[PDB]
Structure 1
Amino acid sequence: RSVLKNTSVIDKIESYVKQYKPVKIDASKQLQVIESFEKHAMTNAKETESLVSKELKD
C-alpha cells in the first residue's frame, strides 16, 4: 500500500476483503453420512470377524 501513491483503492479492497472475510463458512457434512456408514460397516465387519474366527477354531 505504501508502494501505491494513488491509495484510495487499497483501503477499498482492504475493506472489501475484510468484509467478505468468512469467504466460505465451515462445513462438517460428514457426521450424518459417516455415522450411518459406520453402522452398516461395523455390523458387517463384526459378522465377518466372528465367522472366520469361529471357523479357525472349528
Structure 2
Amino acid sequence: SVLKNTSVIDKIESYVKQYKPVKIDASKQLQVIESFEKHAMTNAKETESLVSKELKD
C-alpha cells in the first residue's frame, strides 16, 4: 500500500503465488544408505563378538 503507482506488485505477487511449490524434498536415498548401515552392522557385530570372546578368554 505504501507504493502508489506500482503496476508491478501484482505481477510479482502472482509470480510468487504461482511458484509457491518451488520444489519437493529429495528423499532419493533408500538403499545405498541402507547398504552403508548393513556394512556398519556387520562390522559392529563381528567386532563385539571378537571383543566378548577375547575378554572371556
Query: How much has 1:36 moved relative to structure 2?
Result: 1.1
Greater RCO (Cα-Cα under 8 Å, separation 6 or more): 1
The two structures, once aligned, show a CA RMSD in angstroms of 1.2
Query: How much has 1:7 moved relative to structure 2?
Result: 2.8
Identity %: 100
Query: How much has 1:56 moved relative to structure 2?
Result: 0.5
Using structure 2 for the length normalisation, give the TM-score: 0.83
Query: How much has 1:9 moved relative to structure 2?
Result: 1.2
| Secondary structure of the corresponding residue to residue 25 of structure 1 | coil
The answer to whether structure 1 residue 38 and structure 2 residue 37 are counterparts is: yes
Using structure 1 for the length normalisation, give the TM-score: 0.82
Question: What is the aligned length?
Answer: 57
Runs of 4+ aligned residues of structure 1 deviating over 3 Å after TM superposition are none
Query: How much has 1:32 moved relative to structure 2?
Result: 2.0
**Which ranges in structure 1 are unaligned for 5 or more consecutive residues?**
none
